[PDB]
């Protein structure tokens, strides 16, 4: 026979392999496909869809419908944050369970821009202005309107157009970020504050809630496939 030589790796089984192999059922009449609406080409396009963020994860609210609700009030103006959030899409509890994040859990590196959309679900007679803020990492995490106002931010007016989107632009030292909670690859801080305050007339519910959604932008990508840790089998 043709003189051949075995080189390293022969006989091994790498699960990530891609070769041809003999068929178990030759000449099997495969059933042709039909146009089933809604086919997906890549995982990222699921990522670009906006999913609701379980913000308030307090002992009482966690694992309950309420964790998706962020209560607002008509209290006089304060410079205190409404909600604080870390830019660790794949590792911070609040982001970790959104489709975006869940997806991110299947990869090791993440890169690109993200968008935060907020939905006011109070009454029509309710008015207000807010400041949603994204501060790149490295400094003191914002906790007062003041410092947050210095970073990237959208000032949102409550009105007929029910929702507002703030885009967190890709600002990173590295070409790709870690799916883990890490300092070198830290993402920054996301924060919401009252610009004015919530104002309602009489005979109007004084306290309301807000919904938040997060998704990827057309230039978001992930790499290095790994197994997730949000799933497991005991014995």
């Amino acid at each position, epitope marked *: 026979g043709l003189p051949v030589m075995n080189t390293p790796g022969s006989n091994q089984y790498l699960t990530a392999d891609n070769f041809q192999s003999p068929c178990a059922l030759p000449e099997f009449d495969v059933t042709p496909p039909i146009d089933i609406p809604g086919e997906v080409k890549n995982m990222m396009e699921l990522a670009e869809i906006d999913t609701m963020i379980p913000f308030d994860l307090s002992a009482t609210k966690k694992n309950t419908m309420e964790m998706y609700r962020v209560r607002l009030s008509d209290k006089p103006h304060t410079d205190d944050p409404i909600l604080c959030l870390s830019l660790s899409p794949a590792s911070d509890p609040r982001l970790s369970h959104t489709m975006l994040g869940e997806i991110l859990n299947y990869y090791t590196h993440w890169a690109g821009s993200l968008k935060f959309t907020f939905l006011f679900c109070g009454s029509m007679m309710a008015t207000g202005k807010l400041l949603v803020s994204y501060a790149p990492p490295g400094a003191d995490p914002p906790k007062k309107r003041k410092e947050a106002m210095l970073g990237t931010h959208v000032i949102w007016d409550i009105g007929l157009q029910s929702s507002c989107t703030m885009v967190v632009p890709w600002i990173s030292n590295t070409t790709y970020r870690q799916t883990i*909670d890490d*300092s070198f690859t830290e993402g920054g801080y996301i924060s919401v504050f009252y610009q004015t305050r919530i104002v309602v007339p009489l005979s109007t519910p004084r306290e309301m809630d807000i919904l938040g959604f997060v998704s990827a932008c057309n230039d978001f990508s992930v790499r290095l496939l790994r197994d997730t*840790t949000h799933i497991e089998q005991k014995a």
Partner: nanobody
Framework: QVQLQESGGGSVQTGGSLRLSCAAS????????MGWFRQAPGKEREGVAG????????YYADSVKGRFTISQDKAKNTVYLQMNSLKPEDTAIYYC?????????????????????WGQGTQVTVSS
């Protein structure tokens, strides 16, 4: 994160045994040497005990060797801390400390520097 949830605040007298435990169920780059830090409101926060994730690299602070030992359950996932013969000098708030990438507790061996996930805090009083 990992899960870090600790308890065990029993104000025992001087010379009794106390057990401290911190959850570490989820398996991230898991708590290597782990970490136990006590903050004495007279002093500040300081490192104490720590056994490597897999290996037997357990570092002990000068003040607690022999009396205080570290061990865990490589399955049930929780980190135990046997603190016996308690002095009144050990009255402080303890904390567990996840040091991820094992090398974090191989290079420096002890925790403190390579520690990203912080525990809750349990008050332990050892009085007369």
């Amino acid at each position: 994160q990992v899960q870090l949830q600790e308890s065990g605040g029993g104000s025992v007298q001087t010379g009794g045994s106390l057990r401290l435990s911190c959850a570490a169920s989820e398996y991230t780059q898991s708590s290597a040497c782990m970490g136990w830090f006590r903050q004495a409101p007279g002093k500040e926060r300081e490192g104490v005990a720590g056994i490597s994730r897999f290996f037997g690299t357990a570092y002990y602070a000068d003040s607690v060797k022999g009396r205080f030992t570290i061990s865990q359950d490589k399955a049930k996932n929780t980190v135990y801390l046997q603190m016996n013969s308690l002095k009144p000098e050990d009255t402080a708030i303890y904390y567990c400390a996840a040091g991820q990438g094992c090398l974090t507790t191989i290079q420096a061996l002890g925790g403190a520097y390579g520690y990203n996930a912080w525990g809750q805090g349990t008050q332990v009083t050892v009085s007369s």
